[PDB]
């Protein structure tokens, strides 16, 4: 009852995000090439390197990624999508996958399989009881990829591949995916839209990405009606809003649902220094969010909780946000956040009326979780 799994694969740091900023470089638009795309793998690699350099790695059980099979991927995705990803992976320089901001390098399907497979392998080992919990520091991310496409830097929906494995292979009847990446988990929402056996929750900045989704009225359909929960929050929301959302909506939803496994889509792009959103969460905020969620798992599903890396785009600060979560898993709290004092005076630590109201909009939906 205490052994914490940790997945990193070298190839997670070799994802080729190209020479553009977001979309590709384009001379006619006068978008100058740049060395580091916003989604460049160094951000997540720096998190891995801090896990090692901090000494946290000594308290973790390293777990090798095992490449996701076609069968694994097909539990979350269409055969057509999988076949299309094989095609672009073959291109001599890779290329965009569909949406104009989602570059796959040459041979990049290998990395996408290892990323989904890292989530699956950790899930397997936690669910069997070999491990009590873990963190899969994967790349590329997953939560934007719906059933039939790649989208928003995501090739396959890692957490959904892992949930599908938990359902079909491990025979779990109820799984929860809690996504706190600052962007709406539209892919995950899509995949399990009609399905009450995977409760999908997304805490995000309202309309940050994608532009047309993540409204509280998006609640699933058919037998899945009531088993998708969006918590859109306003720009500028910080630790107070995020913790109020955890206490009023997320944790009660999990307790109502009684999942046999909790998977956390753990992005750190809600951080105070992220370029790709406008939120004010600090490493201490993420710490408290993780502590609450792990304690919830202890109470309702024998501690079975798997964290899977989603987004986050500050190479400076993301490592300390991620380390705080790892420390809550290991219980070894051995390094300060060196930005703590600098960021703590910027605010986000008072629950504003507009933040409170956004969260309260979701509370009446809890009663529909049977």
């Amino acid at each position: 009852h205490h052994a914490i799994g940790y997945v990193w694969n070298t190839l997670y740091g070799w994802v080729d995000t190209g020479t553009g900023s977001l979309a590709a470089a384009n001379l006619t638009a006068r978008m100058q090439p740049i060395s580091h795309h916003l989604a460049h793998p160094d951000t997540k690699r720096r998190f891995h390197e801090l896990v090692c350099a901090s000494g946290q790695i000594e308290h973790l059980t390293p777990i090798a990624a095992v490449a996701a099979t076609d069968a694994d991927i097909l539990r979350a995705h269409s055969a057509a999508h999988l076949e299309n990803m094989k095609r672009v992976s073959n291109l001599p320089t890779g290329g965009d996958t569909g949406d104009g901001i989602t570059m796959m390098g040459n041979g990049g399907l290998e990395i996408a399989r290892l990323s989904a497979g890292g989530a699956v392998e950790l899930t397997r080992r936690v669910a069997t009881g070999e491990l009590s919990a873990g963190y899969a520091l994967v790349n590329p991310p997953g939560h934007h990829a719906p059933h039939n496409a790649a989208m928003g830097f995501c090739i396959f929906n890692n957490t959904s591949v892992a949930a599908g494995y938990a359902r079909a292979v491990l025979g779990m009847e109820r799984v929860a995916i809690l996504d706190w990446d600052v962007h709406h988990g539209n892919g995950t929402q899509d995949i399990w839209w009609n399905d009450p056996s995977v409760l999908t929750i997304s805490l995000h900045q309202h309309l940050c990405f994608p532009p047309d989704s993540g409204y509280s009225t998006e609640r699933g359909a058919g037998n899945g009606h009531g088993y998708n929960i969006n918590v859109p929050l306003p720009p500028g929301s910080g630790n107070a809003a995020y913790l109020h959302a955890m206490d009023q909506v997320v944790l009660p939803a999990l307790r109502a649902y009684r999942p046999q496994l909790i998977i956390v889509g753990s992005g750190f792009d809600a951080s105070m220094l992220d370029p790709l959103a406008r939120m004010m969460v600090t490493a201490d905020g993420f710490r408290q969010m993780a502590r609450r969620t792990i304690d919830c798992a202890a109470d309702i599903c024998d501690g079975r909780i798997v964290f899977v890396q989603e987004g986050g785009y500050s190479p400076h600060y993301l490592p300390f946000c991620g380390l705080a979560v790892i420390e809550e898993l290991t219980g070894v709290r051995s390094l300060p956040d060196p930005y703590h004092e600098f960021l703590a005076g910027m605010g986000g630590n008072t629950l504003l009326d507009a933040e409170r109201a956004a969260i309260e909009e979701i509370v009446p939906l809890l009663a529909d979780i049977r």
Copy 2:
């Protein structure tokens, strides 16, 4: 009555911001070295290169920076501060100047003089009527440096050196400094605190940086009481809030004061993609802010307006925010913002109640501007 000055010096791109993220790299804190400090000069250089590549440079009059003299600097700063900057500039690898986030490279005083001097030289040429207006794309920035210190990446207060020159050398009785960098212009506020001959205005994110300043109650002292105006805005404020602040506070303040010259501390760190603040301004927002301010100058001080670069930390997006301002100066609107559609759906375009109220707090202070 139409000739637009433009200052860039190669050395503005050679500022040595070190190997840290914000503070220096530190092994005991496990702050890993990184190639690009948040304040790395490539951000501003990319703006310069876009000015050239877009063809805007063909509509601009290039103006060489002339190094600020000791006498120039002393109109804004103490002799002790100037002498201290000579000392750290001599260090073999340079070093921090005081506050732990303000690195000067070896020989870096040369660049700091050229940065202040770029502001002065443009000011001189606009004020004499050789030029109608201009943009000084300087680096290092200025607005955090108070009378007796360097602070927040700023060695000398460029806009205050330029205002002091306009006062003492050109004999102007009234100058305005309008700072729309997202961080509080505490340095500028300090320098002219007791002085009604330089009206200092700062539109900023409340308590973003520095942590203890920029409150609406900071209004100057003695004869300068009423001649400093802070407009702190909440995190998440976008184009609607910024334009409401321009229309309700900034432009009326300028009209009340009747400056003979307007200097704009033109930062783009309020942009939607900036890591160092939480605001939602787009290039079209900055465009409208610039258009309004230039038109105000046409109405009240014969078009005499000088823009001087302050902060901004998105190498991806800052160039397009800066280009929009340049286009409003030249009147040649020849390149789209390629991020426009991507960013426009994220919000910030509706004036929220909390934003409106923050701005309305400053309106009663307009009556004290004589």
Copy 3:
């Protein structure tokens, strides 16, 4: 008698997209990890430009705007098929490799290739008219590997050949010389003017460095052009002594024999002591002396009409000082030391070795065939 030195830099020369590979593209199956800076990344040449400015040399130069090379300009050196193929790759959403697997063109990159060739043309025009006495076109992408019908070795169009073709067809010059001291064989230039005695083509290079199968002393042109191509392959490790002996024994005598009306220098700095893409030992003082000699030769034989056009060089650290030395020889304002001078001076290359002397002496009997 006149002194005005032209200088071409265009912002877009620094925006060339060399991709995320090292040399070829990144490739996961081969386990070639992506990297930020390709060997040929534009920062190397941009750092040279920035040093020209920061050193104060720019104050002694006459800035000359690049004018995009027209289709007609390009067709004086290249086939219509090559030009049309470059339009195709330039249109791709992320650009792509042109023919040879190491020559990436970015999206819209044809614009930069036209400005690069056009920079060489515009400087050539203004020197030839006498507006300028001489100049330096700090262009990018480079040119000398591109033959008539292809892109090759980071080169889209052969800038110096476009400029020579302009000097021939538009300015009516009967004799032009292209002296290429890039460390790699100027195979493109050799190819373009192979049959043509009106452009004397000379290449000083490391033997078999790049391309693998060319630059032998036996490659001398054909037909009426026989004798009007001169290769000077030198052994790896050759330094200042060898390069200067080659200038004195072969290059300068060749130019004097030929009596060009204009000298175009393919000015690469990849023969430098710190270059990753060759094994030569030339220092900034070596390049200085090479430039001084060539400029003085131009003064003697073609009224000072000399145009330098940037080719290769891959040390972002040291190339700027090698380039600055050449600029200083043009302006006559020698105001900055090479800060690497003492560090590099003890490594050698300053004695003419027997193998180096012999390699150079192989070319001397060919001088008599230059009529």
Copy 4:
């Protein structure tokens, strides 16, 4: 008879702060522009580590944790004054240059220097006991330029000498050999063991590349150590043929004459064809053959006890493949091609030139003095 190959990598080896200069610090008066990647930046060696993992070689290796070198460990190779001076610079808020103007230590960087020396020690311990048959310590910062009383040439402590001193004093070995094939002269190692015949020190290097005044064949040790230091200076442009001739004629016979109980290899890859900091032409296949020969020699004379310790190498592009070749010779699993092989193979270096042969033959008469 046993086969288990140790491998040392520590995350902090990739965190060495080489600063914002190219070689020396950035300097505005000299107009040396700041740059992101110093020549010695840790990404080069990290890319080697990442390729070891991504290639699947890591699956055939036994990972061995670095253990920080103690003061006592360091003092077997260095003075107390040097150790104390390194504590001082490590304490500086942004670190700083150590003695020589090109050797930057970051803030807290002594921690990494201890882990680097300690990685060499720990691998040496585990090979010597027979737990492991051999191994590779991919350490950083490097060691071989650091003499007894100073840091020099990117080196804080002399890792291989700390390891040899441990093998002598703690493991009681009477004879150890250090074979340094970094392209720069191992002057530090030479200095440390100058008077001492119990550590045979051999350096194959480019003549006068770095440092400027050392590595001559006449530098042979002193007193009881006379004859127990062997320098093999080679000319610029030397490639696989020269390096292998040096191995066969000098290095391997020296080791056989000496009968070390342990062989430590100072394994640099800065002799590679693409290195900016030297002018040699060795390819990954060259390094492969050098490693195979040395490992086979160890098998014959000291029960296979061979420890490789990373020294220099400055091509982030190519070093990983040179290093991988050596790892493959240790594991016997030859599963990835050198993707540069065909590109580099035609550049030369594969014929033994007369000057190269003569440089090597100068050392052969010194073999008889190794008793």
